[PDB]
Fold:
Amino acid sequence: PRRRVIGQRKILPDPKFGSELLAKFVNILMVDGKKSTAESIVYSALETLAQRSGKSELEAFEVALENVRPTVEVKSRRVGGSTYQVPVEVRPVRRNALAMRWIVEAARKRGDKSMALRLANELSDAAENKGTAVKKREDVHRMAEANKAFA
Amino acid sequence: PRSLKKGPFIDLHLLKKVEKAVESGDKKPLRTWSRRSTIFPNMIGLTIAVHNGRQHVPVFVTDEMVGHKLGEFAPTRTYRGH
Amino acid sequence: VSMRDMLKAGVHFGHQTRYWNPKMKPFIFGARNKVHIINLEKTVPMFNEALAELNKIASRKGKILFVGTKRAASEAVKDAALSCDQFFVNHRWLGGMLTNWKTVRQSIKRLKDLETQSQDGTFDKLTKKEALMRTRELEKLENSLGGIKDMGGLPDALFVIDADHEHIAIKEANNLGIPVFAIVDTNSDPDGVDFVIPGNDDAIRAVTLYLGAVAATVREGRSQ
Amino acid sequence: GQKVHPNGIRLGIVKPWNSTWFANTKEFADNLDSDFKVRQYLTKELAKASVSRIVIERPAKSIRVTIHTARPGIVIGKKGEDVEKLRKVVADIAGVPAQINIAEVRKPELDAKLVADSITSQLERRVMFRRAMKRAVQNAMRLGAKGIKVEVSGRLGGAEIARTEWYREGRVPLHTLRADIDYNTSEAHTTYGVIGVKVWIFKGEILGGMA
Amino acid sequence: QRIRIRLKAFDHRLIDQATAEIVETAKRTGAQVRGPIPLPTRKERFTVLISPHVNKDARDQYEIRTHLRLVDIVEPTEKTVDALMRLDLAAGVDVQISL
Amino acid sequence: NQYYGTGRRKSSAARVFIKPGNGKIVINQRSLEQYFGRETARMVVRQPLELVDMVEKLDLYITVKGGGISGQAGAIRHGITRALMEYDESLRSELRKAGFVTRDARQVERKKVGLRKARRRPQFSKR
Amino acid sequence: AKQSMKAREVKRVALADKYFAKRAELKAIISDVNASDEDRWNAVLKLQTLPRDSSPSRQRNRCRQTGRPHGFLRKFGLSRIKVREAAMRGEIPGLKKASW
Amino acid sequence: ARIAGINIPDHKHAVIALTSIYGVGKTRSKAILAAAGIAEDVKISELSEGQIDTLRDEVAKFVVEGDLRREISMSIKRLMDLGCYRGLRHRRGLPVRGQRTKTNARTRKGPRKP
RNA sequence: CCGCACAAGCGGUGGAGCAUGUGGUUUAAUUCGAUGCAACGCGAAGAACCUUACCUGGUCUUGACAUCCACGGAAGUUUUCAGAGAUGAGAAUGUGCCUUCGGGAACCGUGAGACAGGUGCUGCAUGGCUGUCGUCAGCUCGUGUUGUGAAAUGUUGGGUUAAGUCCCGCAACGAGCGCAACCCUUAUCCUUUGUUGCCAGCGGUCCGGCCGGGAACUCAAAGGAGACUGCCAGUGAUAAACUGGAGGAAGGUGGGGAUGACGUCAAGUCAUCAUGGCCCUUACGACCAGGGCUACACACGUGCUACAAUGGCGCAUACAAAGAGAAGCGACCUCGCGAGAGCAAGCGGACCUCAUAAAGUGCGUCGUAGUCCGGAUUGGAGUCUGCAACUCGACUCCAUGAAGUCGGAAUCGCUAGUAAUCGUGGAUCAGAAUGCCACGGUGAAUACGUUCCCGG
Ligand SMILES: [Mg+2]
Ligand SMILES: [Mg+2]
Ligand SMILES: [Mg+2]
Ligand SMILES: [Mg+2]
Ligand SMILES: [Mg+2]
Ligand SMILES: [Mg+2]
Ligand SMILES: [Mg+2]
Ligand SMILES: [Mg+2]
Ligand SMILES: [Mg+2]
Ligand SMILES: [Mg+2]
Ligand SMILES: [Mg+2]
Ligand SMILES: [Mg+2]
Ligand SMILES: [Mg+2]
Ligand SMILES: [Mg+2]
Ligand SMILES: [Mg+2]
Ligand SMILES: [Mg+2]
Ligand SMILES: [Mg+2]
Ligand SMILES: [Mg+2]
Ligand SMILES: [Mg+2]
Ligand SMILES: [Mg+2]
Ligand SMILES: [Mg+2]
Ligand SMILES: [Mg+2]
Ligand SMILES: [Zn+2]
Structure:
C-alpha cells in the first residue's frame, strides 16, 4: 500500500439481523472459513446475553462494545528518530474492529465449558464494565498514557 | 508378510541341500546366498552359513527359528557407536 | 502592400525598448511609450523585393515552406499554405526537419502507410483496441506532418514568422543554403534572413496581411 | 536471460507441426519413434541436398513424408531412383508402405535451416566466422527479409576460451506471438570443439491466425 | 438402422473441415445427416522439468487438446456407405464408422 | 406465464420454476428449509424477492447438484434476478443498485508452479 | 547411458516376452484355490526356476533416445528432456505449451 | 470396581470404563458388552453385582492384565535370545520395523544427546 | 521512487512425534552430483531384486552392444545335471524359407584382428539446456545537430503511468530490443447442436428423462459479439493524465496465465545427450549372486499430524470440480469385521469404471481431562502386489497409547476468492506419496502510510 490506501472489502450485512456490523463481527470470529459454526456461536451468545444479562440483545451488544472500545492508542514510530511510546488517536472503524478483537480473544480465554457460553459471559461482564478485555482497555489507557513525556 | 494361500517360500537349491544333508547324516555346514528362504522343521540341528555381503555367517538352526527367514540371522551391517 | 495598408494593420508595432537586438537599429523608426516602432519606409520595399523573389521561385515550380509555431497563428499559416498549394510547419519545429530529411521521409512513409492501410482494410483483422491504437497514431502523424507529407523533397524557399522563435529552422536553412524569408521583429537577429522583412510577428492582423499578400503573389507566380 | 524456443510457442498460431498424423496412446510412442528414426536416417542421407524441412504424416493404411529442400534434382538423382530407394528404406524402417514426396524451397538463403547449416559448414571450412555470418545476414536482408539474427557460441576460431557473440539486423520481434519468425539451430564440430549457431529470420507479420 | 460416424482429431480446423465434407457427402447420397455434434475435447497436460540438473523448480507445461465430433445418418442406404467409403481426409483425423 | 430459474455457478447446477399467483419454495423435491442446512443460504436466495416485496406473488421450485452450497445459492439468486428483469423489465435499476446483476467472476486460482498453493509460497528460510 | 544398460534392457524384454505363457499359467496355478496343496507347491517351485530376469517387473522404462531411466513419459516413451526439444521443433503432433 | 482386575474402571460410559482394562480396546470392550448384552451408557455405577459377575466372566475369556504383559514380554524375550535381527534392535532399544535411525527416532531412542 | 520491504494484519516456522533432504560420524561400501540469496520433499515424475554407477564374491576377454572378414551350422523348441547364478555339461526334437543349384536371406556358433566399451577426468576447454539479478525497465542505433576531437544530444527537464507509459518543455527527429499489445483461459450475449448431454411445455410411467416427446433451458464447442477512459462531471498547461459518475456481465492494462531485453555471476550440468582434450583398456570394460544407498552419538533444512469442545465419537443426512482407463479401469452378486477374495457386467469410454467428495447438516454423546485429546511405539494375526516383501514395501485387524496441554531468541507466507481449512485427481509406477503437479468446497482479517527495515 505504498501507492493506494486499501483496507477492508465492502462487507454484506447478516441477513437474519439485516445489519453488517454483526457480519464484520462474525468475520472476526471465523476460523478457517467455517462461517456456519461461527455465526452459530454469535447467536447462541447474544441469546443468553439477552436473558441472563438484560434484554435487547442486538443493542446490549453495542452498549458493551462502548464499554470496551478504547479511545487512546499508541503507534510508536521513529517519528523522533527511535522508539518512543507516543499517544495518538485512531479513527473509529479501526477502533471498533480492535474492540471486537479484544473481546473475542478474551472470550477464548474463559473456557466456561462452552464457547458461546464464554462469549456471552464475557460480553455481558463487559456490558457491566467488569470483565476481561475491559481490564486491558483500562490498561491500554494506562499504557497509552504512561510514557507521553516525549512522543 | 507372505500370503497364507501361497504358503512358506524356500528356494529349491536349499531344498536339495537340506534333504541331502538330512539323509546323509551330519554334514559340513552348508553355504548359501539365499537370505530369502524361510526356516523349516527340516533344518533343525543343522548349521548353515548365509552370505552376508562381507562374508557367509554360520547359524545353528533350531526349532523355534522355524518360520523366520534366514536373513534374520545374518546382520548385513556392522556398527559399534561413535 | 502599401505603407497605408500596413500601418492600419499595425505593422509598425514592435517589442519593448527593454527587449531589442543590436543589428535592428537601421530598421527602427524610433521609440514611443517605451515601445520599439518599426519603420515602414524600409519595411515596404524589402517586402516587395522579397515578393519578387518568391514569385520567381514559385514561377520556376518552387516548393514553399511556410513556417510559424505560434499557438495563435498556427491555423493562419496552415491556411496560408493551403491557399497556394504549398507546404507548411504550424506546430513546434522539430530539430532536423530539413537537415535530418531522411528521417522525416521515413516518418512521412509511415503516415502514408497508415492512411493507405485504413482505406485498404485489415483493421478488422487487427483487435479493436489495436485498430483504435493504429487510428490514434495516424491522427497524431497527421497533426504533426500534415503540411509536409507531400513536400517530396527539400523545399526551395522558406517563409518564417518571428524568426527569433524559429531560430533552429533558419540555422538549418543557412546550413543547407535554402533561402529564408522572415518577418523579423525588433528583438530578432537579422543575420540569418537573406530577404529580411522587419515587422510585427505576433499581431494576428499583420501576420494575416503578410500571409495573404505572399500567397496572392505565389498564386500569381504559379499562374504565369 | 534464457529465451524460449521461438518455434515452439508459435505452433498453432503461425507455425504448423512437423508431424500431422493422429494416433492413440497405444500406438503413440512407437509412432514418433518410427518417424524420428526416419528423420534421422534422412538427415544423414540427404546432407548434400540442402534439405530444410521434413514432415511425417501417416494415413491409416500408409505413411507419407515430405521434404522441403533447395536441391531437388539432387534428391531425385535420376528417375527418382535414389528417391525410390529412399522410399523403400523408409517403408521398411517404418514397416509400413511409404510414399515420399519432395517440395523444394525457393529462397534457400531465406530459411533458418539452410542458412544455419551453410554457416556451420563454412565454419568447418575454417573460414572466418565473422565475415561468414555477415555474408549470411547480408544475403538474407538483401533478398527481401525483414529481420535476421545470427548467434554463434563457444570457442570461437579455436580460442582457448568460449567467446560467444551475436549479430542482429532488420527487425525480429520475439515477444510478438503473431510474428512470423523462422528459427533454427545447427552445430559445428571443430578440431577445437563444438560451436553452436542459432538463426532467426522474420518475414513480417501475418494477420488472421493460422489460416 | 443407423450409421454413426465418430471423429477424433487434433485441431478444430481440420476436424470441422472433415465434418463439413462428410455431411455434404451425405447430402450427395440424399442421406439424413445429423449436423456435426461437438463433444468434449480432452486435454492431456504434462508438467516437466527443463534444467537437466539441480533446478526442479524450473518447469514447463504442455498440453494435447484432442477435438472430437459426432455425425450421424439415420437411414443406412448403400448409396450412402459407398461414398462413406470414398472418403479422403488428412492424416490428423481418425474416423469411426459404425452401423 | 413462464419465468424460470436455472442456475449454474463456478460449475454449480440447479433448476428453478418461478410462477405468479402464489408464493412457496421447494428444493430438490425437498422443502427449501430442510435442504439448505445453513439458514444464510435461504436468506441469500430469498433476498431479491423480499427486496421487491413480491415474495407472496410468485413461487419457486428448485433442484440443485453441482457446486457448493454457497455457490449454488448465489447462482439461484442471480437467476432469480435474471428472471425478475425478464418479467417486469422495471426492476433493472432497483436490482442493480441492490447489486444483484453483478455476476461476479471471482474464481479459484490455477495452482501455480513452485507454490504450495496458488498465491502461496513455500516457507523459504533466510536463516 | 552405458550401452551395456541398453542391451541389458532389451535382453530383459526379450526374456520376459518369450516366457509370458509359462509365467501366466504358473501364476494361474499358484493363485487359484483347489490346488493339490502340493501342485501349488511344486508349481511355485518350478516357477522360481524360470529365468529370474523373465519377470516383467524386472524391466525398467528407459528413454528410448538416450537410455536414461528417470523422467520417463509413458505416453511418448521419452525422457523428460528429449520430449522437450522433440516438442519445440514440432514433432509431437498437436503438442504445444499450455496456458490456462 | 475390582472386576477381577488390579485396575478399577473409572465412573464413565461402560465402553470408556472397560477400556481401562489393559489388553482391551474399544472393539474388545463393546464385544464384551454386547456379549453380556448390556447397554453402552451405564456407568460402573447403577450396575449391581448381577452384571459385574457377567462382565468378569466374559472378560476372563480373554487374556488380560498380568498374563498379557508376561506373554508379550516372553515374545520379546525369545526374540532377543533368538539372536534374530529384530531381537537385536530390541536389545539395543532402537526401532525394529525399519524406520530411520538417521533422524527423529526419539520415540524409541528416548531423550536427546549432544 | 519502488517491493507483503516495513507498518497494518491473518497464518505459520523455531518446542513435540513422525516423514523426508543434507552434513557429520560409522562402515566392507554406506553410489554420484546439487552448497548463501539463487544447495538441503534438489537431479530422483517414485533404491525390496531390478533400478544401481557402490561393496563382497563368483566369473569373461574382439567382448553385454556395433561393422568387417572368414569357417561352419536352418531357425528354433522342449528337456536333464552341476552351480547361487552367471554359467558350463548335455540328450532328444525340429532342422525351415527366396534360389536361375551358387548361394542369399535367416539367425547361431567359432576364429581373426581392425575394434568396440568407460556414469573415467576436465562445466575454469565446449555445444545444448537451466537458474539468478528480474518480468526488473530498461538497452541501444540510424540520421541530425554540436564540438578540432575524444564525445554529447536524443535517453535530460516539467508532469504522468504497471512501464524509456504518455504529454508538454526541450537540436533533436526517429528507430530498434524491450514495455504494451497480438496467444491461452476466465466473466455476459448471439450458431448450429442434440448424443451418450439436456427435460421447459406435452402423453404414459414401475415415478426412474424412464419413455414417448420436445430443441426451449443447462450444457457441450465452434463461430462470433462485447469495454474504448467510450460517456458525464470535476482536476489539471486546455497537456498527458487523475478523481468521480453514468451505463453495463464486465471500467479504467476486468481476472489469471504464457511471454524473461542488454547483460550479470569461469552460476549449474562432461551421470540426459552431444562434444575438445587426457585416461582405461584380460579392465576404470563385460556378467552373476548377495549386500549397500534404508547405517546411529549427532546437527541443519523442508514437511506431516498434533496438543483438543469453533472439539472428538456415534447416528442419520448432505453437499463439487478436474481427471484416468484395455498385460487397463473393473460394475453387480456372494464371501470376509476388514485389508480382500470368488464370480463376472460394462466400458478405448459425455455411455462403462475408478467414484458414494470432505469440511457441512440433524440428533445424541463426552464436561476440560494428558481426556473418548493425541496417536508415536511395540505385541499378535492377517491382506494384496511381486521370481522374491530378513535386511527393506503398502494395507487390515486385535492389543499397546510416547512425547505432546500452543512452543526461547528468531523467523516465514500472504492484499481476495487470497489467506486459512476441506477433500478430489494425476504423473511416476508390479507394488511402494506426508513429495510433486493439478481440482473444486468453505472462506477471512488488514493495509494510516513510506518514518524506517531490507532490497532495488
Ligand atoms: Mg524460461
Ligand atoms: Mg554413450
Ligand atoms: Mg520397476
Ligand atoms: Mg485398535
Ligand atoms: Mg507486520
Ligand atoms: Mg521441525
Ligand atoms: Mg551425497
Ligand atoms: Mg562428476
Ligand atoms: Mg520443492
Ligand atoms: Mg545386482
Ligand atoms: Mg558455466
Ligand atoms: Mg521526464
Ligand atoms: Mg524529448
Ligand atoms: Mg507483453
Ligand atoms: Mg480492457
Ligand atoms: Mg463506472
Ligand atoms: Mg565454476
Ligand atoms: Mg560444481
Ligand atoms: Mg537416496
Ligand atoms: Mg477420459
Ligand atoms: Mg484416539
Ligand atoms: Mg482450494
Ligand atoms: Zn516578435
In short: The helical segments of chain C are 3-9, 40-59, 74-82, 101-120, 128-144, 167-176, 204-223. The first strand of chain C starts at residue 28 and ends at 32. Chain C touches chain D at residues 122, 125-126 (CB under 8 Å).
